[PDB]
Amino acid sequence: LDKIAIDTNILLYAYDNRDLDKQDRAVEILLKKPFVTQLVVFEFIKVLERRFKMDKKEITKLTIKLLKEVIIPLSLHRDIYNYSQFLLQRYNFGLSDILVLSDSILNNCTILLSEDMCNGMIVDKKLKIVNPFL
Amino acid sequence: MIKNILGLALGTNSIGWALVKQDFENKQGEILGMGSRIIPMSQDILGDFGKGNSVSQTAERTKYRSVRRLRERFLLRRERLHRVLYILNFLPEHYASQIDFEKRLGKFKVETEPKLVWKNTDGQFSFLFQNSFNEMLEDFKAAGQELKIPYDWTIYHLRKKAISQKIEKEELAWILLNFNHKRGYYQLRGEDFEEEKDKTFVRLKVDRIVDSGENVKGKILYDVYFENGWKYDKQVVKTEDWVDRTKEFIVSESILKNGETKRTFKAVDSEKDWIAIKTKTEQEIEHSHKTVGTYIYETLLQNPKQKIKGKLVRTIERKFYKEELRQILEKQKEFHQELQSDDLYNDCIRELYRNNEVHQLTLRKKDFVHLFMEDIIFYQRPLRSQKSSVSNCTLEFRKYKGENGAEHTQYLKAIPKSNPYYQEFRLWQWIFNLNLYTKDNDENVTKVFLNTTQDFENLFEFLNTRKEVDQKALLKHFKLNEKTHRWNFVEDKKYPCNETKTMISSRLDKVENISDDFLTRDIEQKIWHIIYSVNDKVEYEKALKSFARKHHLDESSFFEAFRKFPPFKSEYGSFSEKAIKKLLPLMRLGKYWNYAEIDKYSRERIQKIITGEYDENIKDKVREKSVHLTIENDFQGLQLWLAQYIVYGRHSEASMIGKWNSANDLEVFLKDFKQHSLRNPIVEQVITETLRVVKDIWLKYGNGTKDFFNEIHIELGDTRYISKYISGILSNIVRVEDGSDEGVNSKNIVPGNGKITTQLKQDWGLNDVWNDLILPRFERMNQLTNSKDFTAWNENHQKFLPTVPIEFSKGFSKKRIDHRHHALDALVIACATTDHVNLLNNQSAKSDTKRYDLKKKLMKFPKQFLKPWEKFTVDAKHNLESIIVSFKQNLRVINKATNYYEKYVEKDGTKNKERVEQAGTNWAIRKPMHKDTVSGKVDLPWVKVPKGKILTATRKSLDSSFDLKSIGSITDTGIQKILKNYLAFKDGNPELAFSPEGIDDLNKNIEKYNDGKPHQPINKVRVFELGSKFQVGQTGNKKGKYVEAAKGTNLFFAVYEDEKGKRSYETIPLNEVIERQKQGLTSVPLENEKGSRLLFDLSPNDLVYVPEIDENIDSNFVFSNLNKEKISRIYKVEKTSGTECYFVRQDIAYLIKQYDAKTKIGELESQNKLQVTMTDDRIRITDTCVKINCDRLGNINFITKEKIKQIFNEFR
DNA sequence: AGACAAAACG
DNA sequence: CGTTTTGTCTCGGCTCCCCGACATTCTC
Ligand SMILES: [Mg+2]
């Protein structure tokens, strides 16, 4: 009834256990097989290897496990850059966030889950950001 | 010495250009460049602009806009009716429930199609007015027709009944909306014509034709009599079609001064002439002595099969509808209290006019009757004011400083020629120009009758009293007669003589009961202003009466005199009122002349001129002309030129000549060019493209440096218009500022003639080069025809010359079948020096010797002209064989549009009407999205539908074009059966079966062709077609409308390639392009469903290169070594459909022979264009083509080291 | 009348 | 698949601004 996507922060909060409630919430999202964008996967890999210094082998294995069983990667859309340029005029965010939103919308995603994106804001009348942890 | 010469040849939609560096004295030189720019235009435009038939895109856009405007205003009227009725509590509850009254006022709620009278309960529709239906059935039974009729016919029964009986309020609302639907014909001005205005549609029979003994053209013209006792105004020759013939005319009768009717005649055809049909219907309704509604009702009682809409009453004067509605409303106001509730009237007024207190107050004095007819249903807006578009004075300006800290000029509008001031100015001018002559010896007899100021005062006094003057009146004035003298103007012509004041004085004289001094100059001006500014009947009469009250004049004969004053003709002078007021004092003489009436500056100039002192604002030509103006009293009776100079200090328009110093001036000129500024769009487009091409050439070959182009030549070959304007504009580039070159056009501009061009071409052998160039097409046509009639051997030249058989020689011309002849003509023109044009335009010498020098300098020994240089033919061939035709493209799909609408804005605690801009992004679609015909979707079980295709059916008239094959395409099977039976009964001949007489007979006897089972008459039948038609829209019933792509909208043709290498082709619908461009995305998707990457997209007029069969062009580039072979493999896209893309070689303009279904031959087969190359290899172009990009001058563009570097150097 | 868009015909 | 054939929205009224071509008279 509504295609749902996620950002890196959701999977990070899942991976982090300092915050039991937020980790629980993020894992609760993942029980719904939410969609996701490949750029989210790449950014997750980078953050894993930089902040947490985890091994390349372990990070790759976990990426494969999650992409196989829990979540669903979204095929990169060739119209991502043109649309992102279209979104930039009306929207002033980080180009990375703009790219994520561009790909999510181009895949008909109806809800995007993230914190640092001015929650509740509607992007081009096609996708409303939802902040779940509140 | 070295001269840069730029030759231009301008066609209807083509611009050939050549640039040469010639040194004629030494017979040296070389062709620097050559090319042709093509503006695509269909042959229909070329063949229609000669005669003219709405040949303009702007006119078509305006037509659509007007249609849309009428539709929108009707919808607004309906919504206002909805609001008013809902407040009045008249609408039925089920109907009112579905209409928005809060946000989208009066409109139906989204995705709803409510019907006022049909109530939907649990999926069943029931009629609302049962008792009225029963009454109508009772009336029908009384008429003895039938008892089974559609429910909706009750509307007319109610319309009849409301006139003298009470009806339910919902019925009244239905009636009112029905009236809103049909408003009738009405003309804004009105101006009831001749009180009789007979204009009566009558049908007369010819009694006899007494030959009138009027022998004309070897035949005696007969007269005509009518049983009524009327004689036809015009005589007749063809007796066969007149004797005892029942003809119908529209006769106009006017009571002539003798006291008798001056009946006129005008032949008309009923059911074919708008006026005839309208007048016939009006007369028929009037004779019945009843309102249109009851006329329709009774016609329906008599003939229950009658067609009402479009057949019985199409269009009639709005007075009928207004009278019927007034009667109905007045009668119903006697019964329904809500129509008498002042509270409800105020409520409705506030609802409609919450923000217009003035109009609210004005309406508060009226009643519901006025609100319903005058304000809501029958409110027609007046014409927009065109006064803003009037021309401006050439003399008086004003200067003011805006909020931007600039100082810009406002213009003064011209004076309406009917103005008394302009009349006086013109009369003085004519007086000064007048001068008499004697018939006998033709001597300037004047200066003896108009020699002292008294004579001129007498003449002016005489002229004022009149409205026009002529030979006899003017000669008789001086006591002179015709038999000795004349007046230097057209002997039989009349001239305006201050008709404004005349007419005013005459209508003031008819009023009587006033002293013969009321009409003074001030009162005259006031009356003229009243007549000119109040162009409205009611306003005009109110203004008349008010004027008659303020001035103590009996308003009894005054309005009678002035109520029928003819409106002034729309025409304006060159100068404004201010300039005319300034110039009149200088022009006047005698008692009408007084020194104090000259403004301060002009008086200062007069003092300076008489003094003879020195002023920078006064020229030497002044004192030369003003030698006689010694004293102030010499400043009397000054002609236009003298007074003009004195008032403003310029000897008329001296022009500015101007001189452009670089391409920047030209590009500014182009930027500030205004649309619709010339004769027609075609010449404007040609001129603007010519200027752009000239700028490109200047930049490329001279860096836009000053005086780079030594000389420019022009040729055209109706089109004459662009001959002088282009020369004048381009004079600014090739001018000389030393003073030698002065005039309308620079002396360096050298227009040519076809004589020089053709004679140079023949003498110079360029004809031979052209024949050689075009010959291969003619051998190809020979092969195609398997004959040898398209090429003829000649022994004088010992070669084949191209030719066409006589049958294919209707309008063939060897030159027009290509695009490069424009460039050839440009080259010919560029080398034709001023000597050549002078020699061949004035070859008449009066002596062999004087023109012998030009002969020797320019003609070989008079046989032929010398070449500009030794290798001219070789250079021309080599350049012509390497010319890429550049085509202008129009790929507009969406473009931003601005909307400003009136609205009440709240500022400083006040509501004020002003223009607010529309917010959000509002695009305008710059192409027709679909064809006009709309078809419905059908499912026929007895026809196979392949996947991806649908059946769509549309109504068509049954005519002779229905054969068995076509008869097999009707959706209905009973109709197919009946039609087949009828056609078989008619020997299987549709021409006989489905003629109008045949169709009438079939409708009469439908039993015999339907197994004896009854059947409704057949007039139209739904024919189906299997194809791919898309929905018009997605809201309401628009999903039920299926249409086809509009002509010339398959603008994009995508080509993808997979990893393997095979190519995929697609045609993108215009709609998808619209969404993609709205989203900021590219027009063509960069990847198809299979994931094949997009190689590129093609659009009409795009240029592609098809490599040779052996060539492997994967990363070729190197688009600079373009030889005749490479250029010969360049094609231009023409049209697209599905996966098919048609091409034509770039250098081809017109086919040697087109395709005819009978002979079945053409230069490029049935489509006049091929999907493959024309060469023997005949390879699929789309399979190996590569797109190329060319500029206005026809130079290909390919990525290079410098290009790539710059790509992100611009960003660095 | 002209020439596109697509059915229709092989 | 390659080629040819086919169908394509149509008619009425009236007013008010502008430009240009050609003639005539006059002036610079
Ligand atoms: Mg981010």
Query: In Å, how far from its chain's centre is CA B827?
Result: 37
Query: Is residue B1046 exposed (0-12), middle (13-18) or buried (19+ Cβ within 10 Å)?
Result: middle
The answer to whether B109 and B99 are in contact (CB under 8 A) is yes
3-state secondary structure B365-409: CCCHHHHHHHHHHCCCCCCCCCHHHCCEEEEEEEEEECCCCCEEE
User: In which element (H, E) is residue B1133 found?
Assistant: strand B1130-1137
Give the three-class secondary structure for B852: helix
The answer to whether B1131 and B1181 are in contact (CB under 8 A) is yes
What is the Cα–Cα distance from B876 to B33, expressed in whole angstroms?
A: 10
> In the numeric block, which tokens belong to residue B803?
């030719």
CA dihedral B666, B668, B674, B677 (to 10 degrees): -20
The answer to whether B377 and B77 are in contact (CB under 8 A) is yes
The answer to whether B1087 and A78 are in contact (CB under 8 A) is yes
With CB atoms and an 8 Å threshold, state whether B1080 touches A78.
no
Give the largest Cα separation in chain A, rounded: 41
> In the numeric block, which tokens belong to residue B694?
């000239």
Resolution value in angstroms? 3.0
Q: At B38, which amino acid appears?
A: I
The answer to whether B484 and B440 are in contact (CB under 8 A) is yes
Distance from CA of B971 to the nearest CA of A (A): 40
Which DSSP string corresponds to B298-363?
A: HHHHH-TT--TBTTTBS--BHHHHHHHHHHHHHHHHTT-GGGG-HHHHHHHHHHH-TT-HHHHHHH
The answer to whether B823 and B36 are in contact (CB under 8 A) is yes
What is the Cα–Cα distance from B298 to B313, expressed in whole angstroms?
A: 13
Strands B1186-1190, B1196-1197: pairing is antiparallel
Give the three-class secondary structure for B1004: helix
Query: In Å, how far from its chain's centre is CA B876?
Result: 43
Angle CA B494–B500–B501, to nearest 5:
110
Angle CA B472–B477–B479, to nearest 5:
90
Q: CA-CA distances (angstroms) from residue B493 to B91, B439, B474?
A: 69, 17, 12
Strand C nucleotides where any atom sits below 7 Å of a protein CB: 1-9
Q: CA-CA distances (angstroms) from residue B350 to B266, B363, B482?
A: 52, 10, 74
Q: Which of B717, B742, B722, B721 is nearest to B731 (CA)?
A: B742
> In the numeric block, which tokens belong to residue B425?
């100015």
Q: Which residues contact B835 (CB under 8 A, 6 or more apart)?
A: B854, B857, B858
CB atoms within 10 A of CB B699: 17
Q: At B321, which amino acid appears?
A: Y
What is the Cα–Cα distance from B173 to B94, expressed in whole angstroms?
A: 14
**What does the buried/exposed string (b/e) look like for B494-520 if buried means 16 or more CB atoms within 10 Å of the residue's CB?**
ebbbbebbbbbbebbeebeebeeeeee
B935 DSSP β-pair partners: B1042
> In the numeric block, which tokens belong to residue B377?
């249903």
> In the numeric block, which tokens belong to residue B371?
């609100």
> In the numeric block, which tokens belong to residue B401?
């400083």
Q: Which of B777, B889, B926, B823 is nearest to B1134 (CA)?
A: B889
Q: Which of B304, B406, B273, B351 is nearest to B86 (CA)?
A: B351
With CB atoms and an 8 Å threshold, state whether A86 touches B1079.
yes
CA dihedral A13, A16, A17, A22 (to 10 degrees): -10
What is the Cα–Cα distance from B313 to B869, expressed in whole angstroms?
A: 79
Query: Is residue B660 exposed (0-12), middle (13-18) or buried (19+ Cβ within 10 Å)?
Result: buried
Please provide residue B1151's backbone torsions phi and psi, each rounded to the nearest 5 degrees. -65, 150
Q: Which residues contact B711 (CB under 8 A, 6 or more apart)?
A: B3, B4, B5, B6, B734, B748, B750
> In the numeric block, which tokens belong to residue B939?
């499912």
CA dihedral B804, B810, B816, B817 (to 10 degrees): -50
From the Cβ of B1049, is strand C under 7 Å away? yes
What is the Cα–Cα distance from A66 to A71, expressed in whole angstroms?
A: 6
Q: Which of A52, B286, B863 is nearest to B294 (CA)?
A: B286
What is the Cα–Cα distance from B1174 to B135, expressed in whole angstroms?
A: 78
B711 DSSP β-pair partners: B5
Q: Which residues contact B401 (CB under 8 A, 6 or more apart)?
A: B407, B408
What is the Cα–Cα distance from B603 to B803, expressed in whole angstroms?
A: 78
Q: CA-CA distances (angstroms) from residue B1128 to B406, B690, B884, B1106?
A: 57, 26, 10, 9
> In the numeric block, which tokens belong to residue B456?
């001129």
With CB atoms and an 8 Å threshold, state whether B1081 touches A78.
no
User: In which element (H, E) is residue B1140 found?
Assistant: strand B1140-1145
What is the Cα–Cα distance from B459 to B1008, expressed in whole angstroms?
A: 90
How many angstroms separate the alpha carbon of residue A13 from the centre of ligand 1?
14
Which DSSP string corresponds to B951-977?
A: EEEEEEE--TT--HHHHTTBS-HHHHH
CB atoms within 10 A of CB B390: 13
With CB atoms and an 8 Å threshold, state whether A86 touches B1080.
yes
Which DSSP string corresponds to B1047-1071?
A: TT----EEEEE-SSS-EEEEE--HH
What is the Cα–Cα distance from B362 to A70, expressed in whole angstroms?
A: 73
Query: Is residue B765 exposed (0-12), middle (13-18) or buried (19+ Cβ within 10 Å)?
Result: middle
Q: At B795, which amino acid appears?
A: E
Please provide residue B484's backbone torsions phi and psi, each rounded to the nearest 5 degrees. -140, -15
The answer to whether B917 and B900 are in contact (CB under 8 A) is yes
Q: CA-CA distances (angstroms) from residue B706 to B21, B199, B710, B830, B1075?
A: 16, 70, 10, 20, 47
Instruction: Please report, rounded to whole angstroms, the spatial distance between the CA atom of protein residue B548 and the C1' atom of nucleotide D24.
Output: 43
The answer to whether B145 and B124 are in contact (CB under 8 A) is no
Residues B159-165: contacts with CB under 8 Å, at least 24 apart: B159/B291, B159/B293, B159/B294, B159/B296, B159/B297, B159/B324, B159/B328, B160/B293, B160/B294, B160/B297, B161/B132, B161/B135, B162/B328, B162/B331, B162/B332, B163/B291, B163/B293, B163/B294, B163/B327, B163/B328, B163/B331, B164/B331, B165/B331
How many angstroms separate the alpha carbon of residue A96 from the centre of ligand 1?
6
Instruction: Please report, rounded to whole angstroms, the spatial distance between the CA atom of protein residue B1026 and the C1' atom of nucleotide C8.
Output: 10
Instruction: Give A-chain residues touching B1086 at CB under 8 angstroms.
Output: 78-79
B468 DSSP β-pair partners: B496
Q: Which of A89, A125, A96 is nearest to A37 (CA)?
A: A96
From the Cβ of B50, is strand C under 7 Å away? no
Residue B636 DSSP code: S
Report the sign of the C-alpha dihedral through residues A23, A25, A31, A33, in that order.
negative
Instruction: Please report, rounded to whole angstroms, the spatial distance between the CA atom of protein residue B67 and the C1' atom of nucleotide D10.
Output: 14
What is the Cα–Cα distance from B1177 to B1174, expressed in whole angstroms?
A: 8
**Cβ of A78 under 8 Å from any chain B Cβ?**
yes
What is the Cα–Cα distance from B1148 to B1173, expressed in whole angstroms?
A: 13
From the Cβ of B758, is strand D under 7 Å away? no
**What does the buried/exposed string (b/e) look like for B1000-1032 if buried means 16 or more CB atoms within 10 Å of the residue's CB?**
eebeeebeebbeeeeeeebeebbbbeeeebeeb
What is the Cα–Cα distance from B1032 to B938, expressed in whole angstroms?
A: 16
User: In which element (H, E) is residue B903 found?
Assistant: strand B900-907
B791 DSSP β-pair partners: B802
What is the Cα–Cα distance from B812 to B1151, expressed in whole angstroms?
A: 9
Q: What is the CA radius of gyration of chain B?
A: 40
What is the Cα–Cα distance from A62 to A58, expressed in whole angstroms?
A: 6
What is the Cα–Cα distance from B440 to B404, expressed in whole angstroms?
A: 70
What is the Cα–Cα distance from B649 to B643, expressed in whole angstroms?
A: 9
With CB atoms and an 8 Å threshold, state whether A82 touches B1085.
no
Cα separation of the two ends of chain A: 23
3-state secondary structure chain A: CCCEEECHHHHHHHHCCCCHHHHHHHHHHHCCCCEEEHHHHHHHHHHHHHCCCCCHHHHHHHHHHHHHHCCEEECCCCCHHHHHHHHHHHCCCCHHHHHHHHHHHHCCCCEEECCCCCCCCEECCCEEEECCCC
Q: Which of the 925-944 residues on chain B come under 7 Å of nucleic strand D at their beta carbon?
A: 931-933
Cα separation of the two ends of chain B: 46
Helix extents (H) in B703-813: 721-730, 754-763, 766-785
Instruction: Please report, rounded to whole angstroms, the spatial distance between the CA atom of protein residue B56 and the C1' atom of nucleotide D21.
Output: 22
What is the Cα–Cα distance from B94 to B86, expressed in whole angstroms?
A: 12
Give the three-class secondary structure for B983: helix
Helix extents (H) in B18-56: 43-49
How many angstroms separate the alpha carbon of residue A46 from the centre of ligand 1?
12
> In the numeric block, which tokens belong to residue B929?
């999205």
Which DSSP string corresponds to B928-948?
A: --S-S--BEEE--TTS---TT
CB atoms within 10 A of CB B253: 16
What is the Cα–Cα distance from B1123 to B310, expressed in whole angstroms?
A: 67
The answer to whether B713 and B752 are in contact (CB under 8 A) is yes
How many angstroms separate the alpha carbon of residue A8 from the centre of ligand 1?
7
The answer to whether B679 and B719 are in contact (CB under 8 A) is no
Angle CA A46–A49–A55, to nearest 5:
140
Strands B711-715, B749-751: pairing is parallel
The half-sphere exposure of B615 on its side-chain side, counting CA atoms within 13 A, is 18
Experimental method: cryo-EM
Q: Which of B266, B271, B255, B256 is nearest to B202 (CA)?
A: B266
The answer to whether A37 and A5 are in contact (CB under 8 A) is yes
Among all protein residues, pick the one whose CA is nearest to the C1' atom of C7. B1027
